[PDB]
Amino acid sequence: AHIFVKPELVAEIGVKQLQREIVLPGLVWTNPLTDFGGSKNDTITVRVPAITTA
Amino acid sequence: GLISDPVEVDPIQVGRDEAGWVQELRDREAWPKQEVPEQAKKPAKVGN
């Protein structure tokens, strides 16, 4: 037969791996505490006030 | 060969079948529905 030397062509047609939309990070309490340096063990202790009973 | 000879097998067709990217499909008129062909579920190649 007839033999032809051809290049292999690579294309981008917008077919990508379908991948999730990100919604959770805005819905959660982010950074109410920051000063983790300047606290021992990178821990900030949050105080819950006292309630009593009569 | 000769011009009058029957058409011989195209090397392009052989390579095309070797690559295995020609779409095979389920027979539309078959009942019950056929199982999916092997090529229809082959994964994308890791490179090229």
Side-chain angles (χ1 to χ4, degrees):
Chain A
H2 302 305
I3 303 299
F4 302 97
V5 172
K6 290 181 179 182
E8 181 65 26
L9 302 177
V10 171
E12 301 289 85
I13 57 179
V15 170
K16 54 162 99 168
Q17 322 193 40
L18 303 171
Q19 184 177 2
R20 183 178 63 244
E21 182 181 1
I22 300 165
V23 298
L24 290 181
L27 319 167
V28 191
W29 203 9
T30 308
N31 280 314
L33 296 171
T34 294
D35 214 8
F36 293 103
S39 195
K40 293 187 286 185
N41 305 316
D42 305 327
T43 294
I44 309 189
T45 187
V46 179
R47 165 170 39 209
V48 189
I51 65 169
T52 188
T53 58
Chain B
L2 309 172
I3 295 290
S4 81
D5 270 354
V7 161
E8 53 189 357
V9 171
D10 199 356
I12 301 299
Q13 189 265 329
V14 174
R16 172 185 80 191
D17 289 17
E18 212 289 314
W21 287 120
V22 171
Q23 203 54 48
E24 292 83 4
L25 304 168
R26 284 177 308 110
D27 186 19
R28 171 162 63 151
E29 291 307 322
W31 196 254
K33 67 176 182 179
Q34 313 181 331
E35 76 289 335
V36 172
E38 182 66 27
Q39 189 273 330
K41 65 179 73 175
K42 65 182 280 176
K45 183 175 174 66
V46 188
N48 63 358

